[model samples]
Target chain A: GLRQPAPFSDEIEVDFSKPYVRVTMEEACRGTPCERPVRVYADGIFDLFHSGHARALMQAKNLFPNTYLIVGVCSDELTHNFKGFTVMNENERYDAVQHCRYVDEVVRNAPWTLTPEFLAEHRIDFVAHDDIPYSSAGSDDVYKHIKEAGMFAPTQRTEGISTSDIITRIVRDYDVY
Target chain B: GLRQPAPFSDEIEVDFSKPYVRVTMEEACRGTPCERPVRVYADGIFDLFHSGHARALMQAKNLFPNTYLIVGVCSDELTHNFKGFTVMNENERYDAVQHCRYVDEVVRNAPWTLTPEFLAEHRIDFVAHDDIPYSSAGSDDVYKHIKEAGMFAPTQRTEGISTSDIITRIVRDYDV
Candidate 1:
């Protein structure tokens, strides 16, 4: 399934009877065979919290048969420098992402550059995002390191609906707005 | 119930054995007993399609036990003169309203003022909206006639989430 039908819940524990097993990228992609669910991470600004963002989270939440989706919403201060100014403040963005049914947990003020320490702390099994090259902060692709580590899980982006598109729509019709 | 749990559908026909019943404002408020569902109408600009508009529609849609909700969205030309310029065009506004889970049908280019002829054509049972006096077109209240005719079904407006509030939020925090 591309997306799950139910909202996120942490109470649903995997079988504790079996000893914990580690899941590789191939095993996680096919179906999680380990006792614990795969922990997938996806991070972004998530300014408007529109259908596009919701669908992306949905994809990540249902990437594997058993997956815990952790959404990282970057702070407005960090985004202003790397991505640009946001319509919603950091608190609003955090709240908006928190409300999504697909999101299991939200890591507030997430770092722009993902570190091994951050991944270790979160116990992230894979980093899910669109594979398109995101050039920011003097780097060609921010997910380049994650890709090299074989921790990247790519999801398809919805066409014609994005933060950029919505912002431009508002800007183009500025007089009316 | 303040709001219904289900989405809009037109295929659910009331019992055909009985003749169609005309529900009064009082009867509709208590609960619809008529063979046909009350045709409740709510009109607005519905720009940006936020939660407030959705709640308004939900109230109107669930006002009676069974209801066929018709949403009227005004044109850009009409709104520009009466309400103000809109961020979204008339077509966009119409489509946005049409997609609402509560709305059964959408009336495009709905008149600024409701007329008896219009009511008769649509077989509208009552006009649902907030009781707040909407002063427009040189009148203190555009719904005065509807109120006088006992066709108005007042619904509460959701606070702090209006189109004005959203637009102002963008304008006030202009720099950031």
Candidate 2:
């Protein structure tokens, strides 16, 4: 039995009912820490939007303090083919991240393979991801070229969790959901 | 015109449909970056559930890395006294933070003043807040004690946003 202290601090709360909160671009994005924003890149099928993804974005954003982190989400067709049965569509996936603070801009229908052309067009300075090699479809690693070119910035994968596992959990906890 | 390339990259997204997402404390909580999870604290009104609040929680969660970030929202009765009026009640505000990925736990009816004694019971290691002064009711800074004990970690406030401002925006953009 603990006696609660006084509620004197300016600790207020926010809106929870709405599924999607659309803040203005200016409001949602903080731009770069430095005056000129350095665009950084990271991509994936951010299904289920877990803390793992949030942490990765934070790590990416922290890489170049003054940077605008651009996240790319794979399209449903691409993800369905490679990963097998994605839970969310591209637009839904986009909405979830658009609401996140770490993400400044989102590239829909992102390419499975990173390209120099894509990098040049986006004005990307760094490609951030956990070093775990993700080679799919007879390729050495989608990020192999970027890794070799030293454009890749290593980020830690939040241990013990993944989108794959969450999907399993979703199926496992189907009744719970 | 340069074609806006696809929103492709390894960047991902998540769902936020449910009102209160009770992520099994074990699965959801990564539990402190280096080792065991250290409980960290942050207090607020959390009135419109905006990005300002989201950024603050994200900042707190980032600090401990592997730590559990616990948030506190004062009661509606108490809120009406100082801030004039709060749109959401105690339980409602509690549900909002409970759903946030950055928050491991939400302490409803959180104390107005930060106290070391409370920190100990909660196994809390540090209290996080912006250095900005939160004055009200003849008092200067409410988090006065935690600062003295040196348990306070100053987090940057999400600039250009506030609950009051959101409310004002709501009223101003009333027609639209």
Candidate 3:
């Protein structure tokens, strides 16, 4: 009873019958689709999946008229080593992302850093994120390469709410909670 | 974004044109409606407004065809004195519950305990909630009177998830 919608199908269907056309970030953001559905990739730890995460994924899903939203959730081991510990395990977080109506596909145990090989494997047309320069794992911006490659499609983050903020709320009223 | 549906209407509309009929809990549970919509009442602190709360409200909303779900939220002062401190303030909590599609009406600053006058004023046909005996506010069971009066329509609680459970998750991972 986590209050997310049930999946309409067992797996995401990609209409390979249609011709695939690669588009620029500007074209992807313009809300026009190619002959085939654009495969957009979004990645995160997705721990304690909340409304903020859902809204971000919704933005990714609605970027184009016909777009396939492939969400990549980092593994618990990788997240703890790089990002930090998570409240929910990787399996639980993956299940949470799979249940969201906006998500078309779920990539479990995604890589901490994106690679050209990973992009080729997924046939991703673009990467979706907030465009914030995330300085972690000894890098000034983990998405610097994607930005330079012109494969980044910016999505706005929800204000005043985040996984960190939710944790802080509980930590503040620690005794009472 | 809080990811809840936008309200279709500014306020809930009650069709006063139809005649009202009183029904027993057994009849309410039968999932058949009378000529007029049944007004079902649900109450809670609703702090954090997680999915557990949403599922419970959804059950209440869909109990009977054409049921009007009225949710009562306690004030911050009362909750702090009686139940416990809340993470979200009353205004924020009220806004959270208001955004839920299942809730037809919201009663602010609702009384902690119910009375006949309160039921009469709202014209409530039944009170919807989990049958678990909640011991709070120096009473063994707050809904004891409602159960005795046969106005209680049971709604099951979502298992393994709640506002408290969410808080526990955060607290457990503290400093990790």
Point to the candidate with the largest DockQ: 3
Q: Is candidate 2 or candidate 3 better by lDDT?
A: 3
Tell me the RMSD of model 1 versus the true structure: 7.7
lDDT of 1 by residue, A21-119 (tens): 446877886876444678889999987556667667778877887887888889888999888878777876775565454666778889998998888
Worst 10 residues of 2 chain B by lDDT: B1-10
Off by over 4 Å in 1: A1-85, A88-177, B1-21, B33-35
Q: Candidate 2: misplaced stretches above 4 Å?
A: A1-33, A175-177, B1-176
lDDT of each: 0.72, 0.62, 0.74
Cα lDDT for residue A153, candidate 3: 85
For model 1, the local distance difference test gives 0.72
Docking class of 3: incorrect
- Candidate 1 vs candidate 2, DockQ winner: 1
**Decreasing TM-score order of the candidates:** 3, 1, 2
Error of 2 at B133 (Å): 36
> What interface RMSD does every candidate have?
9.5, 16.7, 6.2
Worst 10 residues of 1 chain A by lDDT: A1-10
| Candidate 2 Cα deviation (angstroms), residue A76 | 0.6
Task: Identify the candidate with maximal lDDT.
Answer: 3
